[PDB]
Amino acid sequence: IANRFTSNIKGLTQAARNANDGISVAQTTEGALSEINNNLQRIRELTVQ
Amino acid sequence: SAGSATTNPLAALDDAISSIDKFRSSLGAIQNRLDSAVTNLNNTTTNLS
16 A cells, blocks of 8 residues: 555656646747737737728 | 939939838838847746746
């Protein structure tokens, strides 16, 4: 049972690290998207003009 | 060889001014896109760090 607990603990810690990496991916993509949205807003303003 | 008075001076001056204005507009557009690139680079650098 101690061996099983050790396996579970190590697996869960590594899974937490993987989840942190996923959050990083989402942050980067969302930053790029924000820049794209700013560009689109400026394009719409120019079109209205 | 000697010449004569220009037939249509104001039209030529207008054409020169128009060319200058087109160059200025293109330069301003390039500078705006460069500033947007700077902002995107800063955001991506922060996220990757």
